[PDB]
Swiss-Prot record:
Protein name: Transcriptional activator Myb
Compartment list: Nucleus
Residue stretches making up the HTH myb-type domain: 1-52
Domain notes: Comprised of 3 domains; an N-terminal DNA-binding domain, a centrally located transcriptional activation domain and a C-terminal domain involved in transcriptional repression. C-terminal truncated mutants display increased transactivation.
Free-text description of this protein's post-translational modifications in UniProt: SUMOylated by TRAF7; leading to MYB transcriptional activity inhibition.
Subunit details: Binds to HIPK1. Interacts with HIPK2, MAF, MYBBP1A and NLK.
Designated gene of the protein: Myb
Function, as annotated: Transcriptional activator; DNA-binding protein that specifically recognize the sequence 5'-YAAC[GT]G-3'. Plays an important role in the control of proliferation and differentiation of hematopoietic progenitor cells.
DNA-binding region boundaries: 26-49
Length: 52
């Protein structure tokens, strides 16, 4: 499956997954998010949820 815009529910789940796995295991994190691949999770984290 392929998803486009992120929902608030997905963002919340991503926050919890990064807390569990850390910001380097993107492939494992993506396995828990339907329709998402590792790079999408990485970009959502660095650009929107945890900006510099
Ligand atoms: N996925």
């Amino acid at each position: 499956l392929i998803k486009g815009p992120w929902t608030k529910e997905e963002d919340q789940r991503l926050i919890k997954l990064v807390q569990k796995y850390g910001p380097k295991r993107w492939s494992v994190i993506a396995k828990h998010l339907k329709g998402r691949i590792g790079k999408q999770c990485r970009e959502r984290w660095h650009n929107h949820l945890n900006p510099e």
